Amino acid sequence: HHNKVRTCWNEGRPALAGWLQLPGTLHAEALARLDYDAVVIDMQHSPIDFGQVAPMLIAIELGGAEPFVRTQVNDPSDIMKLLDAGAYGIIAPMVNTRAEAQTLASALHYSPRGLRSFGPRRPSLRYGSGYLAQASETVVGLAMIETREALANIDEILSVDGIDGVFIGPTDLALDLGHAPLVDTEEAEVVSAIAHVRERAHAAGKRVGIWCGSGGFARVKLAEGFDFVTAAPDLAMLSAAARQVIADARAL
Amino acid sequence: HNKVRTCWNEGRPALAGWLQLPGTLHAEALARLDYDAVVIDMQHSPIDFGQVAPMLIAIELGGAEPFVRTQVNDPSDIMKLLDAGAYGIIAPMVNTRAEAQTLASALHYSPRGLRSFGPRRPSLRYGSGYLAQASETVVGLAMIETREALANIDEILSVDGIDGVFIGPTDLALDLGHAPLVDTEEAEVVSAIAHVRERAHAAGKRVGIWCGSGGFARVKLAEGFDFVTAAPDLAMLSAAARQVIADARA
Amino acid sequence: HNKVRTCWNEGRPALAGWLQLPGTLHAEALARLDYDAVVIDMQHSPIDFGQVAPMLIAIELGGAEPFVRTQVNDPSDIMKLLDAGAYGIIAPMVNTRAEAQTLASALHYSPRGLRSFGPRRPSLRYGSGYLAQASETVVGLAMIETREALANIDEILSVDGIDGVFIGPTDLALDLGHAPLVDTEEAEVVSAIAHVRERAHAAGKRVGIWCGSGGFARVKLAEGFDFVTAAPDLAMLSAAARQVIADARA
Amino acid sequence: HHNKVRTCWNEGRPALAGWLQLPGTLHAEALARLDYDAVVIDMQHSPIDFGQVAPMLIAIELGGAEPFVRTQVNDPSDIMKLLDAGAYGIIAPMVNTRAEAQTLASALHYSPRGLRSFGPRRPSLRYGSGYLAQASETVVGLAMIETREALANIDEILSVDGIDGVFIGPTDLALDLGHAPLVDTEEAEVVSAIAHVRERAHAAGKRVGIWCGSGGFARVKLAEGFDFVTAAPDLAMLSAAARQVIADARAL
Amino acid sequence: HNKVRTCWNEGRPALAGWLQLPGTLHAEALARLDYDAVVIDMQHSPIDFGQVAPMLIAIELGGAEPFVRTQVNDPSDIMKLLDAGAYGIIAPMVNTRAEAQTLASALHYSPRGLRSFGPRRPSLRYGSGYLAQASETVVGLAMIETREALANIDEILSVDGIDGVFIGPTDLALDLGHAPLVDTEEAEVVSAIAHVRERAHAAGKRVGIWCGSGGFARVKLAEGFDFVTAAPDLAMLSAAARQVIADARA
Amino acid sequence: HHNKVRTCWNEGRPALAGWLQLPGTLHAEALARLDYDAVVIDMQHSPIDFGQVAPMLIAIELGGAEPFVRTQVNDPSDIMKLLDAGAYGIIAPMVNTRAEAQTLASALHYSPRGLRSFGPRRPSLRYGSGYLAQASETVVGLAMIETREALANIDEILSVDGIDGVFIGPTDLALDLGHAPLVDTEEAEVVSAIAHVRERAHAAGKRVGIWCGSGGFARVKLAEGFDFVTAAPDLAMLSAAARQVIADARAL
Ligand SMILES: [Br-]
Ligand SMILES: [Br-]
Ligand SMILES: [Br-]
Ligand SMILES: [Br-]
Ligand SMILES: [Br-]
Ligand SMILES: [Br-]
Ligand SMILES: [K+]
Ligand SMILES: [K+]
Ligand SMILES: [K+]
Ligand SMILES: [K+]
Ligand SMILES: [K+]
Ligand SMILES: [K+]
Ligand SMILES: [K+]
Ligand SMILES: [Mg+2]
Ligand SMILES: [Mg+2]
Ligand SMILES: [Mg+2]
Ligand SMILES: [Mg+2]
Ligand SMILES: [Mg+2]
Ligand SMILES: [Mg+2]
Ligand SMILES: [Mg+2]
């Protein structure tokens, strides 16, 4: 028993992860069974509530990927309930300051390293009675860097011992820097900001991840040395596939 | 108006989506594409009645006609779906004239059928004039997917109150002793499919089929199918994800 | 005690609510009014089994007897509702003595019927003595809503184990070739309703009916109906909202 | 495509809205189809959770009213997830200070006018790819005035550019001022407070709304020049209608 | 591999859990204990299809084979459960050879049965080779719980495609005119149970039974039952809570 | 109509309560029907979301125990929505300071004693139109003491008028004091801390509760004079009962 993403990193390999915005277990299991190391459930920009995330985490684990959640907000009590429901990866949006990164770290570890409340319903079933001793290793925590403010604060954020590193939200970052909501961009200012965050993460001996909208862009990010790359949202892949089926059906 | 009936009345076939995943977000998103209808599969999916109800609403808001492929040809199940705003019904494994008569009985009020009266959602869409035009608001297709159905095709097509038939080519292939392959080239299955189509059109009825690709759907439209579905949500998403991963991993 | 049976044993009819909206808050709130029973409609509503279960609990806490009008006269569906704490069953479209016998078979343990034993919620309410008094805890009504049922009334009423019959006057009006109007004045429908009532009372059975207004319910109570429902939640809420809007907009 | 409430206001007309405390799609659609411009779903004083609100917003839009939510609390991340689920009106309870009104404004607009996170799942489907350019206009935001403290701070609250105005909670206001929980009151002190808030809202070129328990009271509020009037809660109208049916059924 | 079939192929019986409570947390937790299978009861529980679906996934992750005791022996209900990853089916009240043939028809693809093809979850577990080995992945047991079933035992056991029979001793006791007691000592019921066991083993079939205690389950295993369930989640939890309260209150 | 726990306390009797971590109504009703005065639903260390807690509160009340909730976090708006859903007992985890105890008190009372928002959907049905006058008595509020920090602050926490007292989280307390996650412990340091909290609660004329993992430990806590004792979690009792059934089934 081990965190599949931590196993990638311990073997000097990056992790590739899925991204779900659609509630339900069937597609969660089917995607987890593909060559994804993790599958992230998006609880920020989706209609997925806690009652719907709980059985999705089970389905991903059965499919053979590490269950991750991108939370609605950086809130310790929300993050703790997800950990106890068998979320083994947490990505907290809009972490703009060292203090906010400490708030995330506080949720991911038991005392004395954090203030995580004890009652691990699903981790105890997966890991057994030996869980508390290894609990910190079973969990991956990434602070999202999505703003001018987070970019300015990146060295202070990376100095927080309890987070594994940072996950870049490139569309919110492009918007905050005064651009359109650019997806998978080469825009020089946005790309220089993202390169800066990766360079500082690795200099600090921390991990860096990035959200991607396509397989093509994910290959570029992996080939730049990102540690955790997501591609691409279930609803986006499904809509694109339907549009293409319809286009081919209705062609002369 | 029933968007599929509007296609037909205007001399055009209908192209439909096919959902095996529960939920409203992809249902609305696919309904807003160039689909005339979106079918929710209650047979080969985890979708129960509590989940189908909001999906019907989402499809209608997206601007496609909501259809349901039911778990079974059962009149009371069909009547509850109709009153929940399912405006097309595809009933699996209709094998006999009696079974086609059971389907027709569910889709029409007395004296044409025995549909129980309590049209919760259709009354909201169509108003107090609903009863008079109820029959035309609903499209009903009996599924031809066995040797027995294929043997009994003319008598199934004889039943007034069904709009026509919808081929289940994987179940048909399997019952003919062939592999249940999507979009099959198997000569006997392809000949059985063309026979059902010709028989439906000769009886003044409509015919539909399930497809797994845009390419196959283009052929069935060209061959004169009236209602073509392509392709299942879970299949399309799985194949897309496989491609993304293969692109990403180089 | 079954509150409806207590009304009957004390020489009083029962007045019931009628829910087509899922959820527990209005179910408890209507149960706390001067209703003896609240019926949950699983036929002409979006309510599935997962939603009916907590509604039964809410009605019982509010202090009305929980009833269910099932989607269909199916023994296994009725048995699951009984074991979930439905203490009244109204089965739609009971047209023959055989169909009434199917309903009675579901409502009684061997040797009277064939009800499967596993009474999850009734055992909590009634304790370990439940089996001996099980029959008296449940009220079962066959719906008379077709020409065929009306023709077969005496033989439906002959079936021991059903408490009596419940008229579906909109389906009856429609099957008699009339408008399916709530609370109809149509002479033949009104005469058919009085006939069913007289036949039930002559057979020593109970009779109920669906009403759309307090005024009509008052008449049916005065005419000697034993179980009168008025009026559906969605209808009452819709008419109330229309009035509020008309008041507000001046 | 336009916000039906904003269209009323642009045409110098007030908006009349429904108020739901009962979960489910069928009554939501049926009421939306009546002569209501909007229907508000109450997530503060109801058992409605996020999983239940999501399909109700769809049902209201299909019925042809603008979907609104009265949120449980003034929390930016909760408000953002509702916007991305196709809530086009937000009413945030207990907004007592200018700082709290700024917190609400921050959630309702993308950078640089706010800090709303980008991922508009349902608005993108309703409005298309041209959504970001008009996003602020598609959304109506009202701060609730329900306390002595909010009343004292009304000019500071109204000075916040990012809110369309204020929505009065007359029962909580009556309670905070030391009265019984008065519904649709003429009580001189409560009525003078409410008149003050309307006068200051209109002086500031802002909109003012009020919650009503009856059609009669809603007519009075509309005829005083309120911009957004709700009447009346589904559970209240249903209970009153049932009581009257029973009273008529059991009459001699 | 089907874990129960693996027990049988290795000359061992299977011990199973029994859930009447909906939800995934206790389902996974009991599946991780020394149970070979966990049965979800859809007959005497509030569990609907929407709730059973995630429970099947939880049991499989816990490392027990997921089974379902269905509400009724209905082919379309069984086929939807199979496609949702129910790998054992126990059908209540199988009373005749015809009813056993109806069960067998649902569990096998043509030409052995008439199972409709669309194996959503089994295809994920078993891959594209699923069709060829489908029959062996599923365990099907007909319930013997009436006088009529007991009378028709040899002809039920004659049906190829059913793995064997599962005794419902409380319904059997009640239909024989005895108390529906868990783990009964009633001489005629005990003799009926041993007869069904001997008949199943003589026909080369498997036999199972429902138990209420570890002590009784130990005896049935020793007597040579192939599939023993003990004990229902709600019963075990209720008795445990009663003990805790009695300990606490002194 | 009365709070069953307050009735115990008014009659000089302690209350014994159940503890649910499993969603659903059937076991909630069955346990409520046993000799428990209350049943607590755990929304911190369970997968229970608001949509699942709502019908469980109904089931417990019908079974004839007082419905309690141990909340995910000490958040006033979450606590208010539970009160309006017919939670009549609130246990808020991780209350570490007098200020946090005041935050809990603020949620449990209407103005002027608190700032609870008015809209009591279920309490109004249970208690009728006379509810506001007795509302404070219908509700039991307990602040959880689970940390070194809460222990140091126990006299300041107990000085908050609006809480009935404190509920000890012995496992989180043992962890915070540097021990293993000890369940039902006699460990001298943890036991002295718990005895101190009980002694200070009773000296302050307040009530004290404690979570137990067994019937045996609950008897000891009752016999020490605790006012509110819980035993034992549904999932723990069910797992132990299954293990024993299996052990007996597979015995030689
Ligand atoms: Br792959
Ligand atoms: Br398109
Ligand atoms: Br009343
Ligand atoms: Br209107
Ligand atoms: Br074990
Ligand atoms: Br007890
Ligand atoms: K994988
Ligand atoms: K369309
Ligand atoms: K359901
Ligand atoms: K009552
Ligand atoms: K409207
Ligand atoms: K196991
Ligand atoms: K009790
Ligand atoms: Mg972002
Ligand atoms: Mg088929
Ligand atoms: Mg009817
Ligand atoms: Mg929920
Ligand atoms: Mg208020
Ligand atoms: Mg049985
Ligand atoms: Mg704790």
Residue numbers in the entry:
A (entry chain AAA), D (entry chain AAA), F (entry chain AAA): 0 to 251
B (entry chain BBB), C (entry chain BBB), E (entry chain BBB): 1 to 250
Copy text verbatim from the article accompanying this structure deposition.
Here structural analysis of hydroxyketoacid aldolase from Sphingomonas wittichii RW1 (SwHKA) revealed a dynamic movement of the metal cofactor between two coordination spheres without protein scaffold rearrangements.
In the presence of ketoacids, bidentate substrate coordination affords M2+ A,S as the lowest energy complex and predominant state in crystal structures. The M2+ A,S complex is additionally stabilized by side chain interactions from the protein environment with the coordinated substrate. In particular, CH‐π interactions between the electropositive C−H bonds at C‐3 in hydroxypyruvate (HPA) and the aromatic residue F210, play an important role. Alignment of WT SwHKA M2+ A,S with monomer B from variant F210W (containing M2+ A,S/M2+ R) showed no significant change in protein structure by the F210W mutation (rmsd=0.190 Å between 243 Cα atoms).
